[PDB]
Amino acid sequence: LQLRPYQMEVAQPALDGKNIIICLPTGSGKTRVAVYITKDHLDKKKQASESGKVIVLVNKVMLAEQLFRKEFNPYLKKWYRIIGLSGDTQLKISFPEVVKSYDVIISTAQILENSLLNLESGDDDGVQLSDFSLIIIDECHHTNKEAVYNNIMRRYLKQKLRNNDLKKAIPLPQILGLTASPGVGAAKKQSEAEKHILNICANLDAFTIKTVKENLGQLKHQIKEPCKKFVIADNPFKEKLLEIMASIQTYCQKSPMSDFGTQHYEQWAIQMEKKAAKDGNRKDRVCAEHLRKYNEALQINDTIRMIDAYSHLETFYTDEKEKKFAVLNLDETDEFLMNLFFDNKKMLKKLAENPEKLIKLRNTILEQFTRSSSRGIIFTKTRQSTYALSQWIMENAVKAHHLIGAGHSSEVKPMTQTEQKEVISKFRTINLLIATTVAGLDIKECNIVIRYGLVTNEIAMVQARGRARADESTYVLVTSSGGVTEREIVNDFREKMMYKAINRVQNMKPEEYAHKILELQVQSILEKKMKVKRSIAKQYNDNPSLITLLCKNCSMLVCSGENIHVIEKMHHVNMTPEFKGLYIVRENKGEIICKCGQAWGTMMVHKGLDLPCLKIRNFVVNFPKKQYKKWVELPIRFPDLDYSEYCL
RNA sequence: UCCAUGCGCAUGACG
RNA sequence: CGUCAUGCGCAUGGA
Ligand SMILES: [Zn+2]
C-alpha cells in the first residue's frame, strides 16, 4: 500500500473524525487510499485499544469479491481479520457473529439491512450500528432518500438527532464515502444541482466533498482522457404491414388518436386492453395484444433487420398455432387475425430478404476493422437486439459474441454471472462485445466504443469513456437522425455543472452549511415517517375469500377465494380437482393453459405434489373489474396449505 | 453448476 | 401516478 500525493491530502481530514465524501475519476485507484484510512483508523483504535470495526458496503457482489481478491487482503493479510461476504457466497456463520469476530468486513448492502430488521422486526439475531467505529461506502451517487444504500443512514440520522436533543450521548461511527463523479439529477440550472448535492451530503451527514485541485498534474499524467468525438451513419415491407394494421383497426373500430411506431400507440393499446378486460369482451383486448406485438415489430423494423420481425412473429404465431391445437386436443377473431397474417407471411419473408434501416453501419465498423479492430465494444438498449445483431453479423460479416445481464424478465433466456466472467476473460485476451448498459466491469485498452441507439446519462457516458482509453477512442454515436447528439451535449454540460457547483459548495460557511444540511436531514426523516404512516395504512383488509378469479379472454369462472392455498408463503395454488377438470397442459423444448387458449401457469412439482400454480397477471378479479400484475397488491390473505388435507 | 419463483431498488424514454 | 425498455440486490425451493 502507498499514499500517492494527490491521495494524501484528500485523505488527510478523514484521519481524525471528519465524516466526509470523496469523488475522483477512474484510474486514480481510490481503493488504496481507502485501505490507508482503514489501517490508520484501526491503528488509532489500537493506540486507544477500543473496538475497531469496518463494515464496507457496495451495490454489487462482483466488486466485493474483487476487493477480497485484490486490495484489502493483500495489504491487510497479516494484521487483521477479513472476510469477503455476499448474499450468494454461502457463509455457515451468521452475520452477528462475523460482527462478533472479523474486525474488517467487505459486504453488500441489504445483508446489513436485513440483519438490522431482524434486530428490530422480530426476536431474531439482530445487530445495530452501535457495534462499529467506521463505515466505508462506494459509489455514493446511488445514494438517495428512497433506495438502498441507504435507508439505514436515515437511522444514523434519527439516532444522531436523538444524541443532539440529548446534547441540546451514545457514540456513532465515522462515515467515509467514495464515488466517481457524483453526477446530478434532473436539472437545467446550477441551483437545482447544488440542492441535489446538498441532499447527497446530508444523506451522508458528512462535512465536505474534498476533491483534488492542488495535485492535478500527476493526475492528468496518470489520467489521459480520450477525445470527445461524434460520428453518425444513417421500406415497402413496413407499409405492407401498416396497411394490415389499419385493416385491423377497421375490423375492430379502434381509434389510435396517434401514429404507428411509438410508445403512445402501445400505451393506448394497453389501456384498451384493461378496459376490454374491464368489459370481458373480445376483439377488444385480444387485438390490443396483437397490436402490441405488431408495434414492437415496427419499432424494431425502424432499427433492426426485418428478418428479425419475421422471427418475432414466427415465434408468436407458431406458438398461437400450437396453443390452439393443444386446446383442440378458433373463432372469427382468431381465424380472421391468423389468416390475415398467414396469407401474407411467405411473401413478407420474401420482402424481408430485400435491402436506411437495412443498410446500416457496415462501414461504421469496417472503418476500424481496416484501421486496427482488435478490441470491440457495442452498446444498445435491449437484449433481443444483441442476439439478433450477433446472428446477423456472424451471417454477413469479425468473430463476435453477445452480453446481457441476469434478471428474470422480457421472456428471454438470460445469462449468468459465471458466463459473464467467461466472456470478459476472453475479451481480456473475443474481439467485440455486444452489451446492454451493463458496462462496473473491468475492461480497458479499447478504442471503438460505439452507441447504437442510446440515451444514457452523463455517468454512463464518462464511464464508457473510462474504458476505451487514450488510444483512438473513437466514440461513435449512431442514431437515425429522424436529438440524440443533444444527449452527449448535455452530458458535457452537466460535466461542467458539477464542477461549477462543487466549487460553489467547497467554498461555504461551516455554519450555513450546517444549517442547510440539518434542514435536509430533518426533511428526509419526516418524509420517511410519512412514508411509513401511509404504508401502514396501505394493507388493511386481510380477507380469506372475497373474490373469484376469472379467465380474462373469456370472462369465465376459474377459482374462488377459499379453495386457494399457498406454499412457501410465496406461491398460490388450487387443488380440489373440481378445478383440475378445466385446464390443459403444454410443454415444448411444465405449463398450464386454457380451454380457450389463454396461458394460466406452471405445474409446480414440489413437496411431493404436482401443485398447479398460476400467475395473477393472466387472471382477472371479481370481488369492479381489476388487474394487479402481482398478488401482494390486495391485502386479502389466503391460507397456507395443510398436507394432512392430502391424506390418502 | 444449473433451473424455477417471489420481493425490493435505481436508471432512461414515454405519456 | 401509470407504461415500456435496461440494469442491481435480497430471499426461497429443486436438480
Ligand atoms: Zn378460458
PDB file of all heavy atoms in Angstrom, chain A residues 551 554 594 596 600, ligand 1:
ATOM      1  N   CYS A 551     -60.800 -16.219 -16.068  1.00  0.00           N
ATOM      2  CA  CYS A 551     -60.052 -16.038 -17.295  1.00  0.00           C
ATOM      3  C   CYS A 551     -60.390 -14.673 -17.862  1.00  0.00           C
ATOM      4  O   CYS A 551     -61.502 -14.167 -17.693  1.00  0.00           O
ATOM      5  CB  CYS A 551     -60.360 -17.144 -18.302  1.00  0.00           C
ATOM      6  SG  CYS A 551     -59.493 -16.956 -19.880  1.00  0.00           S
ATOM      7  N   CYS A 554     -61.941 -15.085 -21.946  1.00  0.00           N
ATOM      8  CA  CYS A 554     -63.309 -15.494 -21.677  1.00  0.00           C
ATOM      9  C   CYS A 554     -63.602 -15.159 -20.224  1.00  0.00           C
ATOM     10  O   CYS A 554     -62.916 -15.640 -19.322  1.00  0.00           O
ATOM     11  CB  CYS A 554     -63.504 -16.985 -21.954  1.00  0.00           C
ATOM     12  SG  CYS A 554     -62.542 -18.110 -20.921  1.00  0.00           S
ATOM     13  N   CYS A 594     -55.269 -22.734 -21.170  1.00  0.00           N
ATOM     14  CA  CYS A 594     -56.699 -22.515 -21.008  1.00  0.00           C
ATOM     15  C   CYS A 594     -57.522 -23.434 -21.906  1.00  0.00           C
ATOM     16  O   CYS A 594     -56.997 -24.121 -22.784  1.00  0.00           O
ATOM     17  CB  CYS A 594     -57.021 -21.054 -21.327  1.00  0.00           C
ATOM     18  SG  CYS A 594     -58.764 -20.599 -21.398  1.00  0.00           S
ATOM     19  N   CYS A 596     -59.861 -21.925 -23.733  1.00  0.00           N
ATOM     20  CA  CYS A 596     -59.875 -21.050 -24.894  1.00  0.00           C
ATOM     21  C   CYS A 596     -58.516 -20.979 -25.565  1.00  0.00           C
ATOM     22  O   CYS A 596     -58.432 -21.008 -26.796  1.00  0.00           O
ATOM     23  CB  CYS A 596     -60.320 -19.648 -24.486  1.00  0.00           C
ATOM     24  SG  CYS A 596     -62.040 -19.571 -23.974  1.00  0.00           S
ATOM     25  N   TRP A 600     -52.050 -19.817 -18.336  1.00  0.00           N
ATOM     26  CA  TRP A 600     -52.529 -19.787 -16.965  1.00  0.00           C
ATOM     27  C   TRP A 600     -51.443 -20.006 -15.929  1.00  0.00           C
ATOM     28  O   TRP A 600     -51.508 -19.400 -14.857  1.00  0.00           O
ATOM     29  CB  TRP A 600     -53.621 -20.850 -16.762  1.00  0.00           C
ATOM     30  CG  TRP A 600     -54.944 -20.550 -17.384  1.00  0.00           C
ATOM     31  CD1 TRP A 600     -55.280 -19.441 -18.076  1.00  0.00           C
ATOM     32  CD2 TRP A 600     -56.120 -21.357 -17.334  1.00  0.00           C
ATOM     33  NE1 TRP A 600     -56.599 -19.497 -18.474  1.00  0.00           N
ATOM     34  CE2 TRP A 600     -57.129 -20.673 -18.021  1.00  0.00           C
ATOM     35  CE3 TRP A 600     -56.415 -22.606 -16.777  1.00  0.00           C
ATOM     36  CZ2 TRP A 600     -58.422 -21.188 -18.159  1.00  0.00           C
ATOM     37  CZ3 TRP A 600     -57.675 -23.129 -16.930  1.00  0.00           C
ATOM     38  CH2 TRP A 600     -58.672 -22.418 -17.636  1.00  0.00           C
TER      39      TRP A 600
HETATM   40 ZN    ZN D   1     -60.686 -19.508 -20.573  1.00  0.00          ZN
END
